[PDB]
Amino acid sequence: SSSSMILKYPYRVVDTHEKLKEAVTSLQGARSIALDIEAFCTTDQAKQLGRISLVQACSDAKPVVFLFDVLTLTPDVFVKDMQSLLSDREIRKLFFDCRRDVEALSCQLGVKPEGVLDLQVFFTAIQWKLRSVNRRSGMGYVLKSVAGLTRQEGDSAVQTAMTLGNRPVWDIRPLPDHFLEYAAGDVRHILLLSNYLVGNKDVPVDVVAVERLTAQYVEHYAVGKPVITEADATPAEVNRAWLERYIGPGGGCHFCGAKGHTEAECFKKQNGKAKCSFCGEVGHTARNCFKKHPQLL
Numbered sequence: 001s002s003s004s005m006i007l008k009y010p011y012r013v014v015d016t017h018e019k020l021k022e023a024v025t026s027l028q029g030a031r032s033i034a035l036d037i038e039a040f041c042t043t044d045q046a047k048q049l050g051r052i053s054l055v056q057a058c059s060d061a062k063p064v065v066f067l068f069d070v071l072t073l074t075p076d077v078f079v080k081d082m083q084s085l086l087s088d089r090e091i092r093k094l095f096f097d098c099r100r101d102v103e104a105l106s107c108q109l110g111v112k113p114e115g116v117l118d119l120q121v122f123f124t125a126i127q128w129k130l131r132s133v134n135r136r137s138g139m140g141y142v143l144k145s146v147a148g149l150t151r152q153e154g155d156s157a158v159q160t161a162m163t164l165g166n167r168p169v170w171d172i173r174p175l176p177d178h179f180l181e182y183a184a185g186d187v188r189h190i191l192l193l194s195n196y197l198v199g200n201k202d203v204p205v206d207v208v209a210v211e212r213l214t215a216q217y218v219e220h221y222a223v224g225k226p227v228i229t230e231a232d233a234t235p236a237e238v239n240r241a242w243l244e245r246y247i248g249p250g251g252g253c254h255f256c257g258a259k260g261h262t263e264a265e266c267f268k269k270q271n272g273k274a275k276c277s278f279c280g281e282v283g284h285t286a287r288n289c290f291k292k293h294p295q296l297l
């Protein structure tokens with residue numbers, strides 16, 4: 001439905017003060033805003049993101065993806081007109097793994113967003129409530145599991161340069177079209193995921209619970225300085241004590257009792273179903289098969 005139109009939103013480069021005011025007015029009338037950051041690649045390959053180059057934004061108020069050129073605009077100009085927007089708790093800010101992004105917004109821009117919802121944490125919260133799984137999943141896994149969508153391939157020229165790590169990559173101006181298109185991809189996927197995860201009676205976790213859980217991550221990573229102690233035991237998981245407090249106890253399989261999978265995924269329940277040895281059907285045994293014993297039918 002409306003999820004199909006999200007991925008065909010075109011990008012608008014915002015690199016002037018007039019384009020910045022036109023974008024702020026549009027984002028002001030929004031209810032949710034998907035956010036992402038493209039930063040300079042760091043030779044140290046350390047935790048903290050590099051110098052912010054682009055901030056990507058995609059809201060439900062307009063069919064467009066704003067690419068704020070923070071490098072050209074300078075952080076000071078970009079912050080002066082985006083601060084209250086990011087500080088407005090009445091507008092939901094959507095992220096996929098907000099940790100290093102919130103750290104960069106705090107360290108480099110001096111802003112701490114309000115009303116944040118981390119859709120990667122949202123997915124892990126579902127995995128925790130159903131399977132007692134606290135691992136974090138990548139964007140593609142979440143897109144396939146939640147929306148049944150296989151995202152298109154990222155441009156390998158941009159992907160190799162970023163994995164290579166010799167250069168800032170995102171310092172060049174103007175940016176090629178395949179860099180601009182690469183940068184606008186994540187915010188489209190993020191806003192799409194919110195339609196499947198927010199306002200859904202089939203989602204077993206309340207949004208307010210994941211909002212409270214995300215606010216803890218923001219408080220931990222928006223401290224106006226580089227974060228040293230990570231909130232999670234490993235980078236690819238979610239703090240279990242935070243899951244127990246905000247989401248509740250972890251779940252498991254109602255059939256066999258084991259954690260890590262649900263009843264629909266249980267091998268033992270599937271292997272234990274009666275399978276007719278005479279006609280192959282699942283559901284009955286040979287002693288009750290009408291095909292083998294027509295005296296029953």
Ligand SMILES: O=c1ccn([C@@H]2O[C@H](COP(=O)(O)O)[C@@H](O)[C@H]2O)c(=O)[nH]1
Pocket residue numbers: 259260261262265266267268
């Ligand atoms: O009855 C089972 C047991 C495991 N798994 C799946 O196997 C993987 C590893 O689970 P485990 O070996 O840690 O039990 C997970 O994807 C889990 O969902 C099932 O689908 N059903």
Ligand SMILES: [Mn+2]
Pocket residue numbers: 036037096097101
């Ligand atoms: Mn990101």
Ligand SMILES: [Mn+2]
Pocket residue numbers: 036037038186
């Ligand atoms: Mn991104």
Ligand SMILES: [Zn+2]
Pocket residue numbers: 253254255256257258261262263265266267268269
């Ligand atoms: Zn089971």
Ligand SMILES: [Zn+2]
Pocket residue numbers: 276277278279280281284285286288289290291292
């Ligand atoms: Zn049979």
